[PDB]
Ligand binder design. Structure first.
Ligand SMILES: *[C@@H]1O[C@H](CO)[C@@H](O[C@@H]2O[C@H](CO)[C@@H](O[C@@H]3O[C@H](CO)[C@@H](O)[C@H](O)[C@@H]3O)[C@H](O)[C@H]2NC(C)=O)[C@H](O)[C@H]1NC(C)=O
Ligand SMILES: *[C@@H]1O[C@H](CO)[C@@H](O[C@@H]2O[C@H](CO)[C@@H](O[C@@H]3O[C@H](CO)[C@@H](O)[C@H](O)[C@@H]3O)[C@H](O)[C@H]2NC(C)=O)[C@H](O)[C@H]1NC(C)=O
Ligand SMILES: *[C@@H]1O[C@H](CO)[C@@H](O[C@@H]2O[C@H](CO)[C@@H](O[C@@H]3O[C@H](CO)[C@@H](O)[C@H](O)[C@@H]3O)[C@H](O)[C@H]2NC(C)=O)[C@H](O)[C@H]1NC(C)=O
Ligand SMILES: *[C@@H]1O[C@H](CO)[C@@H](O[C@@H]2O[C@H](CO)[C@@H](O[C@@H]3O[C@H](CO)[C@@H](O)[C@H](O)[C@@H]3O)[C@H](O)[C@H]2NC(C)=O)[C@H](O)[C@H]1NC(C)=O
Ligand SMILES: *[C@@H]1O[C@H](CO)[C@@H](O[C@@H]2O[C@H](CO)[C@@H](O[C@@H]3O[C@H](CO)[C@@H](O)[C@H](O)[C@@H]3O)[C@H](O)[C@H]2NC(C)=O)[C@H](O)[C@H]1NC(C)=O
Ligand SMILES: *[C@@H]1O[C@H](CO)[C@@H](O[C@@H]2O[C@H](CO)[C@@H](O[C@@H]3O[C@H](CO)[C@@H](O)[C@H](O)[C@@H]3O)[C@H](O)[C@H]2NC(C)=O)[C@H](O)[C@H]1NC(C)=O
Ligand SMILES: *[C@@H]1O[C@H](CO)[C@@H](O[C@@H]2O[C@H](CO)[C@@H](O)[C@H](O)[C@H]2NC(C)=O)[C@H](O)[C@H]1NC(C)=O
Ligand SMILES: *[C@@H]1O[C@H](CO)[C@@H](O[C@@H]2O[C@H](CO)[C@@H](O)[C@H](O)[C@H]2NC(C)=O)[C@H](O)[C@H]1NC(C)=O
Ligand SMILES: *[C@@H]1O[C@H](CO)[C@@H](O[C@@H]2O[C@H](CO)[C@@H](O)[C@H](O)[C@H]2NC(C)=O)[C@H](O)[C@H]1NC(C)=O
Ligand SMILES: *[C@@H]1O[C@H](CO)[C@@H](O[C@@H]2O[C@H](CO)[C@@H](O)[C@H](O)[C@H]2NC(C)=O)[C@H](O)[C@H]1NC(C)=O
Ligand SMILES: *[C@@H]1O[C@H](CO)[C@@H](O[C@@H]2O[C@H](CO)[C@@H](O)[C@H](O)[C@H]2NC(C)=O)[C@H](O)[C@H]1NC(C)=O
Ligand SMILES: CC(=O)N[C@@H]1[C@@H](O)[C@H](O)[C@@H](CO)O[C@H]1O
Ligand SMILES: CC(=O)N[C@@H]1[C@@H](O)[C@H](O)[C@@H](CO)O[C@H]1O
Lengths: 322, 84, 322, 84
């Protein structure tokens, strides 16, 4: 029986919190719109502060109406559905319309250009893999010079790869509540019935050296897991039932620590093929056990010998002292 | 470190053709990062590593021979961990 | 008394090797040339193979004539002589003449462009931090079309930062034996009597986050240490008296292991200020002792607590279990 | 993680002004990555860290006060390592 050990779940991270008793009044739920399913931007208070939003997100564990989530997720595809990859990595050039639904893990985003704040609700979050909130600055003073009309207080991202730039990718919701994200260009794995995956994340199984550092652009680390943040439910609704884990990145020489959620349920077949590469480093460094991402592994060989040692039934464990 | 199957890269501890530097009838030398696995006839078995660079069939380490360098091999990626 | 523990030295890595008895006949020595000191390219056999060069370098431990080395090294400056740094990193643009002598640790190189093989003796090594040799390909077939005249089998590098590109920087000597190197653009630490350091390596003391991954470009990791390779003796003559250490890099998600030399002597003042950042990782991952570069440290906190613990008299050791 | 001296960045374990989140007259709270050091009058000393986020003066952990957040303080980078 496949299960985890260190998997923390925030589904019932509450008790006797009935002071608000109803979603702190900004109830969130999905609504269809001409065959498209986005969040109900109408009620959906928008001008909250960081503390108010954090309080609002604390109460959001139970009242989320799981009705449109499956048919909305029908657009997303597993990593198997794509085709193989080979050759040296090349940076893709995303241009023109992008019909694909951005909430899928395998969505290739556009470069993170300037964006006015008149068409965004809630904070915008960039991912130097840990998440960071991004502020703004007035548009009248600088020569950006009125992208829209009499607008103000405009966001700007303009970041390269985090080893050189500032963040991998950023995400938010636009004024009508639809998810909007951008990031660094992803990797093309073919230039140098199925569809051609453009690898916005660590596509290890479909390409061997397409690591997150080289290819990752966005909150997705693996096709199964992602980096969590207070507005994760705010942006992506369907990831509510995920389970949390602690992650240590070590990106670009600097040290990064955060938490990650995963689309993991007990009993999933995870024999040998459903393992994805991800780069963790030990948090305690001792006890020879590593709480690594479920259905995954790390390129850190064992103490005495090499060869990744992983358990039959519990997948979050990485073994040392082989 | 990885092998090819049904158009899907998969992690393994089997050595590639390029990961082995020298091999003899009873000893293989290889770059660290894999483990040798050999098939002779309807029988593929695993090779015991000591000082991981060099691996031996059975523990009798102390004339090259091309021993089929196959990768239909599962061992050492589930340790079968004995209690520590 | 300041000393090291794991420092391996190849000064006398020989015994009863008198079969050649004189440098395998390709004697190396430094000669002045109109006020410039380079290697005597005249005898200096050139068309050797890898094995022949490796055999040649094995015997090269004693006959090196320490005459021009100090006055040649007078051009180089310590990290203290430069000025402070601040602000976000920006990629410098090296153009025009470069009067500075390339063998100094703080030499900013040009981008690694194409280079014909008609003006290079010995192999050319790029540094994805571990060293790699670079091959060639004939100039006739490709439309690069005869940079010089009837020249053949040219070298091309054309690499970005190793997380995206292929290597940090590469080094060789040209036909007249003068050292020639190139690499990725370094960091400018001022744009965003002394001289402005352009940071071709991990200039931690002069700029806090100017790490090797972001800023380093070339074989130099620290102003004191460098990555060793079989032709280090060939290229840089004055680094004869260095001591070797084992290094684990873990760059760009992949794992890198190699050896490093350092300009270290017993008794150097190394109280607290002469420590340079260097992203190391454990080789044995046990015994709570880290074999780190002398007069340096790593950003890997301790097991139970944090705060880099280093010894008073032995600098190569990084302590755990604080 | 580092401090400024004579135009030269130098490693240290002293907390910056931005590395401390909350401080009381007997307890400091801070982001992991440093250790608090405090000067009162012609006397500066370290603060005992337990569960590195929070630090105590003496071991008596169980009303904010701005305790001078100063960094002319050496300790915790030379462990004075007791034989393990
Ligand atoms: C996360 O896990 C919870 C717990 O299982 C899921 O809630 C459950 O979702 C199913 C699927 O819709 C519900 O079954 C349906 O319930 C409706 C209303 O009761 C009924 O009319 C249908 O015939 C069907 O039985 C189930 O009731 C519901 N249980 C609870 C306690 O909420 C949730 O869907 C999961 N969400 C995601 C995104 O995975
Ligand atoms: C978490 O992982 C589960 C398991 O893969 C995901 O459920 C799967 O969702 C896909 C997408 O809709 C389903 O595929 C579709 O199935 C229908 C009906 O068979 C088919 O007509 C479509 O063509 C498409 O193949 C899949 O059946 C479903 N599997 C299970 C066991 O539920 C889930 O969506 C993932 N959630 C997140 C947030 O990642
Ligand atoms: C917030 O983001 C959503 C998601 O893209 C935006 O919805 C999209 O809005 C555009 C223009 O408003 C729509 O394009 C228009 O529709 C036709 C339909 O055929 C299209 O062919 C044309 O290009 C035409 O311009 C697009 O259909 C629509 N998509 C969805 C799924 O709703 C929304 O406008 C954004 N809101 C703001 C304030 O930026
Ligand atoms: C690496 O270490 C060796 C061992 O100390 C150094 O060799 C020594 O270098 C000194 C400095 O030139 C030599 O002293 C001079 O020797 C010449 C010729 O004997 C003499 O005419 C001068 O008056 C002066 O005494 C010393 O002899 C020499 N010893 C040996 C055994 O070679 C070497 O210089 C060091 N190299 C570097 C780059 O630091
Ligand atoms: C290894 O480190 C030692 C110690 O710093 C280096 O020796 C030092 O080399 C510099 C450069 O020539 C010397 O500075 C010069 O000194 C002369 C005479 O005092 C002065 O006129 C110049 O203006 C310049 O300041 C320094 O004195 C010298 N110190 C010692 C103790 O030898 C050595 O060059 C380094 N070698 C390598 C390969 O990195
Ligand atoms: C190998 O590399 C060395 C190091 O740069 C080359 O030496 C340099 O060669 C150039 C042209 O061959 C010399 O430039 C010429 O000299 C005057 C001197 O004022 C200069 O102002 C002009 O620009 C003129 O073109 C340069 O002075 C010289 N530098 C040194 C230190 O020797 C050498 O030529 C290279 N050899 C090959 C075969 O590539
Ligand atoms: C979800 O969206 C619907 C619109 O499709 C919102 O319904 C309207 O809400 C306003 C604001 O209270 C009312 O004045 C209207 O009478 C509602 N119309 C209908 C048909 O219900 C609904 O409020 C949204 N839910 C929120 C914001 O929580
Ligand atoms: C979740 O949202 C769905 C939206 O379709 C709700 O389903 C509708 O419920 C209303 C009244 O409750 C009725 O018009 C129909 O039963 C549904 N309309 C459809 C399917 O078009 C569902 O009731 C909501 N559930 C919760 C618990 O909020
Ligand atoms: C472990 O070894 C098996 C056989 O020893 C290899 O192939 C698998 O064999 C099982 C048994 O029928 C099949 O169900 C799997 O589909 C086979 N794997 C594949 C990829 O086809 C294989 O080396 C290892 N097992 C797996 C699942 O990879
Ligand atoms: C090292 O090189 C120097 C180069 O100057 C040699 O010094 C020369 O030695 C020869 C004879 O040995 C004299 O004729 C020259 O006058 C010397 N040069 C100067 C500038 O005085 C030195 O002999 C060499 N030593 C070794 C051991 O090779
Ligand atoms: C350790 O503490 C000393 C004093 O407690 C600090 O300052 C150093 O003091 C010594 C004694 O005179 C001087 O020689 C050093 O130059 C001082 N350091 C500096 C950077 O000026 C300092 O906090 C620690 N020592 C050092 C060398 O940093
Ligand atoms: C028709 C068009 O706009 N093509 C664009 C080109 O302008 C741009 O320089 C390039 C960047 O990679 O992407 C593509
Ligand atoms: C006069 C001159 O050549 N200036 C160059 C410019 O052409 C080049 O585009 C730039 C690249 O950073 O470096 C500078």
């Amino acid at each position: 029986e496949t299960y985890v050990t260190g998997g923390s779940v925030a589904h019932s991270a509450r008790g006797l919190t009935s002071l608000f008793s109803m979603g702190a009044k900004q109830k969130l739920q999905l609504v269809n719109t001409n065959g498209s399913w986005h969040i109900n931007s109408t009620a959906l208070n928008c001008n909250e502060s960081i503390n108010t939003g954090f309080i609002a997100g604390l109460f959001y564990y139970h009242k989320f109406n799981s009705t449109g989530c499956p048919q909305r997720l029908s657009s997303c595809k597993p990593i198997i559905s794509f085709r193989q990859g080979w050759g040296p990595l090349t940076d893709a050039n995303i241009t023109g319309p992008s019909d694909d639904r951005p909430y899928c893990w395998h969505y290739a985003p556009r470069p993170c250009s300037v964006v006015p704040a008149s068409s965004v609700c809630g904070p915008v979050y960039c991912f130097t893999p840990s998440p960071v909130v991004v502020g703004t600055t007035d548009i009248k003073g600088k020569p950006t010079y009125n992208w829209g009309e009499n607008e103000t207080d405009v966001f700007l991202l303009e970041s390269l790869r985090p080893p050189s730039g500032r963040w991998f990718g950023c995400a938010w919701m636009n004024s009508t509540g639809f998810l909007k994200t951008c990031g660094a260009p992803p990797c093309n794995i073919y230039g140098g019935n199925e569809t051609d995956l453009f690898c916005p994340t660590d596509c290890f199984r479909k390409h061997p050296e397409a690591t997150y550092s080289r290819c990752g652009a966005g909150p997705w680390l693996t096709p199964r897991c992602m980096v969590d943040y207070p507005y994760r439910l705010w942006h992506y609704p369907c990831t509510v039932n995920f389970t949390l884990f602690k992650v240590r990145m070590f990106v670009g020489g600097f040290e990064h620590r955060f938490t990650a959620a995963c689309n993991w349920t007990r009993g999933e077949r995870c024999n040998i093929e459903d393992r994805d590469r991800s780069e963790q480093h030990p948090l305690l460094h001792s006890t020879t056990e590593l709480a690594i991402l479920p259905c995954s592994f790390t390129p850190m060989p064992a103490l005495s010998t090499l060869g990744i040692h992983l358990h039959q039934n519990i997948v979050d464990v990485q073994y040392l002292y082989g | 470190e990885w092998r090819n199957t049904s158009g899907l890269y998969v992690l393994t501890n089997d050595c590639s053709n390029s990961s082995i530097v020298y091999e003899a009838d009873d000893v293989i030398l290889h770059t660290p990062g894999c483990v040798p696995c050999v098939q002779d006839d309807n029988t593929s078995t695993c090779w015991t590593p000591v000082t991981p660079t060099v691996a031996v069939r059975y523990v009798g380490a102390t004339r090259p021979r091309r021993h089929q360098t196959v990768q239909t091999c599962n061992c050492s990626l589930y340790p079968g961990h004995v209690s520590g």
